[PDB]
Design a protein around this ligand. Sequence first.
Ligand SMILES: [Fe+3]
Lengths: 40, 48, 40, 59, 59
Amino acid sequence: IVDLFASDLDAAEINHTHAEATTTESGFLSIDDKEKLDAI
Amino acid sequence: TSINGKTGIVDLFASDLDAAEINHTHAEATTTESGFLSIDDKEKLDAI
Amino acid sequence: IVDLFASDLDAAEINHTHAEATTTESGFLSIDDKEKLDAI
Amino acid sequence: SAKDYVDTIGEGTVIFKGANLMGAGQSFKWDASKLKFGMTLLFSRYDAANNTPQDYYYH
Amino acid sequence: SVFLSKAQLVELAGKGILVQMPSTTYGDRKYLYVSTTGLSGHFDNSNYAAWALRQVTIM
Ligand SMILES: [Fe+3]
């Protein structure tokens, strides 16, 4: 009974996040960046 | 014998294994959770 | 004997990126946008 | 004979196996003598159009 | 506490069952394939490391 799953099959999960964007790599928008943009 | 309770001629997909598609969208970034940059935020950043 | 991955399963890889956010579509934050926000 | 009585109590008389939605009109009945310990109810997924017993996600 | 009976075992032998965790957020579904002969590991709850079994008792 080979119950395969995305965790061991290099597959991104349905409920998964991404790392915050940095000065060299893109990604999700950080909370601090959103707060600064809203304040400005 | 079986995969995730499926037997015989079975076609499994990303949602079948609780996985995301290639063209899948995430939750938009808010003040409490990280996510995709909203259109309004991008427009405000470009205008500033 | 067959091997399957996320790409073979029309699924997103665990180590995958996303399209940069534009004026019409959402996505990851670009490096230039992050630098401009930091400098502002 | 007492052991037989207790083990047929333990086995349980399955009154339904398969597929059923039991909306407004479908019900399952029993008898006051038939009730000794309780009932066991097992649920799983269905199909709105195919009406096939999806064989996973039990409870 | 979760309970599975003999009739439910026979109707579920060779099949799996998932349980929902009482918490403040939805998720933490533990899926395992228990049959009258034993247990088969559906390791989709390994990611759900926030909750795991403490014990199993045979009645
Ligand atoms: Fe993704």
